[PDB]
Design a protein around this nucleic acid. Structure first.
Ligand SMILES: Nc1ccn([C@@H]2O[C@H](COP(=O)(O)CP(=O)(O)OP(=O)(O)O)[C@@H](O)[C@H]2O)c(=O)n1
Ligand SMILES: [Mn+2]
Ligand SMILES: [Mn+2]
Length: 347
DNA sequence: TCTGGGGTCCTA
DNA sequence: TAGGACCC
């Protein structure tokens, strides 16, 4: 009768996992990131607890910046293995409900629920909250709509430890005067381009002439922005396993690199680590991309397609160093990265 | 106490 | 192939 999309998102996920092994820190500023040493430059916070966010600290903020704003915080090192496991357990529980479940991120998933005319999608959401709490001790919030984009927007209102329903009835009323980058899939660049067209809010964008948007953004993107402004989005929740298109590793060096020999051997290392992981996953490499960023934060990526797909390490390393070779080391290097694109056609 | 790391996909 | 743009 009525299809609902429920977006379930774990609250302050990494901090919550940390709070499981350190319950005395509940209600205190806890900042996860780096090796838990707040003075290291070139590292960021990966999760701030809600109490640390009152001091302005947020994921993405450098650790040194977070130490300046919240001197009393307990800084904890990032524990990805713990976070990976705590996510695996949460999602396994979420599928156990029997609904389509689509996992996005370590801390989120969408769940499809066709419900009729009783009952209430909120009670599904309440049971989801009660289940994950009693089995995992972790708190989630749940945004409810009929499509993924709108449900995800609804979750931002549901936080923390809550539930929120956002549909055609209350879309525009809720969303109308908000800036266009509150829409999932619109960010600061599209926002500035819209502001140069006289469009500063979701309501403005939802009534904008399609041709103005398709001329400026593309015949498909212009229409999509209109759809998203009117509250629409992807409605189907797929339970099929995700098959990654690429795998990559980048590294920002604690001190800018001046020696070619160090650059080659970092590229070689990144290539060989990434290749070893994708081979573990039974994948084959199609393209090799190498990223260079300079001390002035100037970032370019070059990519080369291999003659045929392969997992040959000598071929992949040489590919990576040839692609690196087309750059200039005119300036010192802040970061190098390798990304390996992967064959999709088979598993 | 400048500016992380992991990804996807439109379009030129 | 480049790279702009957005997301978690
Ligand atoms: N730039 C970023 C942005 C996000 N992340 C990571 O992805 C998770 C996204 O959270 P989520 O934004 O979907 C919210 P979360 O931070 O758990 O707290 P909330 O529940 O109150 O929103 C973050 O906590 C970060 O670890 C990152 O590594 N780099
Ligand atoms: Mn979260
Ligand atoms: Mn999330």
């Amino acid at each position: 009768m009525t299809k609902w999309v429920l977006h379930v998102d774990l609250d302050q996920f990494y901090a919550s996992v940390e709070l499981r092994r350190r319950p005395d820190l509940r209600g205190q500023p806890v900042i996860v990131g780096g090796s838990g040493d707040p003075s290291e430059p070139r590292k960021v916070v990966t999760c701030a607890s809600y109490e640390a966010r009152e001091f302005g600290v947020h994921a993405g903020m450098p650790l040194r910046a977070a130490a300046r704003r919240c001197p009393d915080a307990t800084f904890l090192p990032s524990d990805p293995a713990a976070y990976d496991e705590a996510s695996e357990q949460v999602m396994g529980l979420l599928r156990d409900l029997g609904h389509p479940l689509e996992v996005w991120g370590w801390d989120e998933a969408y769940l499809g629920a066709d419900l009729p005319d009783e009952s209430d999608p909120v009670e599904v959401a309440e049971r989801i909250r009660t289940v994950v709490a009693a089995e995992t001790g972790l708190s989630c919030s749940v945004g409810i709509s009929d499509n993924k984009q709108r449900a995800k927007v609804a979750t931002g209102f549901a936080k923390p430890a809550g539930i929120y329903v956002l549909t055609e009835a209350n879309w525009m009323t809720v969303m109308g005067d908000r800036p266009p980058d509150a829409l999932w899939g619109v960010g600061p660049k599209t926002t500035k381009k819209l502001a140069a067209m006289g469009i500063t809010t979701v309501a403005d964008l939802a009534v904008t002439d399609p041709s103005v948007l398709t001329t400026a953004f593309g015949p498909s993107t212009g229409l999509w922005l209109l759809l998203l402004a009117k509250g629409g989005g992807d409605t189907e929740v797929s339970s099929e396993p995700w098959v990654p298109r690429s795998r990559s590793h980048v590294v920002t060096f604690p001190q800018d690199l001046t020696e070619r020999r160090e650059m080659d051997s970092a590229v070689r290392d990144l290539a060989l680590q990434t290749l070893a992981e994708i081979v573990e996953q039974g994948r084959i490499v199609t393209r090799v991309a190498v990223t260079v960023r300079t001390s002035t934060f100037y970032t370019r990526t070059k990519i080369r397609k291999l003659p045929a797909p392969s997992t040959d390490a000598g071929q992949i390393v040489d590919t990576a160093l040839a692609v690196l070779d087309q750059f200039e080391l005119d300036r010192p290097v802040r970061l190098l990265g390798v990304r390996l694109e992967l064959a999709m056609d088979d598993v």
